[PDB]
Design a binder for this molecule. Structure first.
Ligand SMILES: N[C@@H](CCS)C(=O)O
Ligand SMILES: [Fe+3]
Length: 186
């Protein structure tokens, strides 16, 4: 029985219940993430920006079943085209807007990766992707508003691939945490 998370802390408790088992009910997880109404005071601790690129700020380690983190996107900051390492990715906007562009998995032959679609994710909306669906790029295209998003990955992963839009060629990337539990981790 899914209830509305009253706060970020409550959300986290509910997520621990939803991931108590070995599988993931994706529609339920998405519904509870969507139902949490972003309250900036609750997540200010985690919203640590960098001038030059987006940051990844760990909020909860999910008892090993998932990682919950907050990503902070300066104006004009965005990601590569990337996969999610055979894991679930849920993304909820906490502040601002992000452009999500979807791409198919490339064929072996070198070719421009043509965007399949795009959407603008607005405050409080939750998107979902996994590798069976495809690849995406996430970008804060705003010139005036920083963006903040809440990401849940299950199982946790710290490596993925970035894809060259000109060719489809992939490279392995190791991701890093800007902070963990509110603490900057150089
Ligand atoms: N997976 C990317 C963010 C977009 S989902 C990351 O963890 O930095
Ligand atoms: Fe992603």
């Amino acid at each position: 029985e899914l209830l509305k998370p009253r706060t970020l802390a409550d959300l986290i408790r509910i997520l621990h219940e939803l991931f108590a088992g070995d599988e993931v009910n994706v529609e339920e997880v998405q519904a509870v993430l969507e139902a949490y109404e972003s309250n900036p005071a609750e997540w200010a601790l985690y919203a640590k920006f960098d001038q030059y690129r987006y940051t990844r700020n760990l909020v909860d380690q999910g008892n090993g079943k998932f990682n919950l983190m907050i990503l902070c996107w300066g104006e004009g900051h965005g990601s590569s085209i990337h996969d999610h390492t055979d894991s679930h990715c849920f993304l909820k906007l906490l502040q601002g807007n992000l452009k999500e562009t979807l791409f198919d998995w490339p064929d072996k032959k070198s070719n421009e990766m043509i965007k399949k679609s795009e959407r603008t994710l607005r405050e409080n909306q939750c998107a979902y992707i996994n590798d069976s669906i495809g690849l995406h790029r996430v970008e804060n295209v705003s010139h005036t508003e920083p963006a903040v998003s809440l990401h849940l990955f299950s199982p946790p992963f710290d490596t993925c691939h970035a894809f060259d839009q000109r060719t489809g060629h992939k490279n392995k990337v190791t991701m890093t945490f800007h902070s963990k539990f509110g603490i900057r981790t150089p």
